[PDB]
Amino acid sequence: ISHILDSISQNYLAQNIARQAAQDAKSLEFLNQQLPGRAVYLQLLNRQQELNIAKSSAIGNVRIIDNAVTDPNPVRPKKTIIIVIGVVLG
Amino acid sequence: IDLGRVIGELIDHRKLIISITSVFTLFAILYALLATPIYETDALIQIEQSAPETALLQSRMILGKTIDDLNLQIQIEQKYFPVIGRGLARLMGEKPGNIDITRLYLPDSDDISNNTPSIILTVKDKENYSINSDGIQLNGVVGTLLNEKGISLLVNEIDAKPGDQFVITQLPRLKAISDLLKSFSVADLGKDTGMLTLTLTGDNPKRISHILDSISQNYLAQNIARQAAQDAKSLEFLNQQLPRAVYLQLLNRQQELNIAKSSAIGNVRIIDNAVTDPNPVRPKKTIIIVIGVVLGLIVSVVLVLFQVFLRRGIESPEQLEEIGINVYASIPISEWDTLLAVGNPADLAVEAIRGLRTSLHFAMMEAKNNVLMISGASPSAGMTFISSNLAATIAITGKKVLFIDADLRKGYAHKMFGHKNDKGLSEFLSGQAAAEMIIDKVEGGGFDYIGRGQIPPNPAELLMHPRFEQLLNWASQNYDLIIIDTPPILAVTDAAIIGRYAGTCLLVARFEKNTVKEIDVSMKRFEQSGVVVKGCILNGVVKKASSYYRYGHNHYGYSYYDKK
């Protein structure tokens, strides 16, 4: 469960940075599909790199302060409340 | 009432309680098993709020687009003749047949009520099929479309077995939308987030996921399109406004608006495409069966609670003795035209009649004569059962007993003893028979008996004849005991006439059929006519736990024999 919670954290970490870039990635996606007067072609090249840098540097909103560790004491079953209820119910 | 009373009542009515509860649980289980399972699929939508988006998802514009895409106005239902044929077919492991229809145009009757025309498709094989709307039979084949009789139908990929029928309904577009809108719900799940949780329920697990995907995609296309439209409208005017430095400046704005429209991206977003939860959400079998048990119990309890508060019959001899009525015996029901005292002398009811025989030997002493009249309140209370068996238990003790069947109305003692039916008590009272010709011997008995004879038209007036007292005065010298069986006193007055010549009179009370006031009314009707009723005989007692808790004793009696 500690390996799973580490995977969930890292996937959400890798995924979150990607999400903010997704708005600029879709713009970059259509720009690459739209790369063919020449002065405008240079203006597109300036937008071409600006979308490359924005996507690459767009990592934010998620920080993992602590990695997953397992509490060695089980949370269930709660032996004391079970035995106590066993006495009282009996 | 207390704990013992109610627990005894529950023990006594345990058959009723168990049967009613089991019927309720059986109905609950049959519903939980035969009800069609309804699944639920969910998608997650994340808007870039989320208030106006909900009403646009549930609109007839978005939902109506899904009905057109998936042809949700073509309703196909497997044909099952009963209201349970679908559920049991699922239990038998039969996979439900499904046919894919891509084109359906019915003749559109559109009459006063049936705005939804319907046909019935009967699968003949994997390839061809039949159609019958109103008896008109039409043969169709997968592939080749059908345009006949004003009926357009295109069936693709019949996945079923031959013989299966299907009801194909072409419901109106609004009805298809209203059905979808009824099962389709939208939520926010955070009340602030841009997340929308689209859920959809239905009996088909695969179909509802295709529908929720169509709804989501349509909503996604529309949402993004609107954001795209603003930039498409500006780029539209730019294309309309292009007429050299400003021209190049507009060219930069030209592509900057091309990129935006191309990028698109609605504020709304999809994070999870629709998948169906394989566990049905309805019917909830556990809560249905549990309610079936609990509802069956509270119904069984109120019925038992009613029968307890409504019953008025006698429950124990104590009820009769609270009024001052001596109960000389309590005869149990004999579970065994025969005399019980002769057929089964060891019966528990004969053992109780022997206890009456010894109780009478002490009560019939100090009486005027040896004549014992046995009457009762209501018919079929056991007056003939007790008097005839009491005569049999006194006959084995070596006494001469005469059993007179003075029930000139419905007396059947002659049938119970073996009869020469001629010359009974009627023929004697009417003067057409001598006292010696009417006495007959019980074969397996030990006592003589006088039958009623032919039913007279005036039974109560015959018993008033002075011949009846002459017969009793004559028989009282040739017999040690005369037992007179009579009709019930609350029916006719015959017993009050006969009771004038009987030294001892006993009433027979039926266990649950007679009431305490009914027996008190009977004893006071005798006393009003000069007949002193010595006591009562409670008849037909059954073993009941309620009597053991209400009173200390159930008054049934114990079995005492050596088992061999």
Ligand SMILES: Nc1ncnc2c1ncn2[C@@H]1O[C@H](COP(=O)(O)OP(=O)(O)O)[C@@H](O)[C@H]1O
């Ligand atoms: N304690 C009993 N046990 C078994 N059967 C009984 C008992 N009392 C009556 N019966 C039966 O129920 C019927 C009613 O008895 P019956 O003598 O005809 O009633 P009555 O003369 O009071 O109208 C009879 O067939 C009788 O055999």
Ligand SMILES: [Mg+2]
């Ligand atoms: Mg009778």
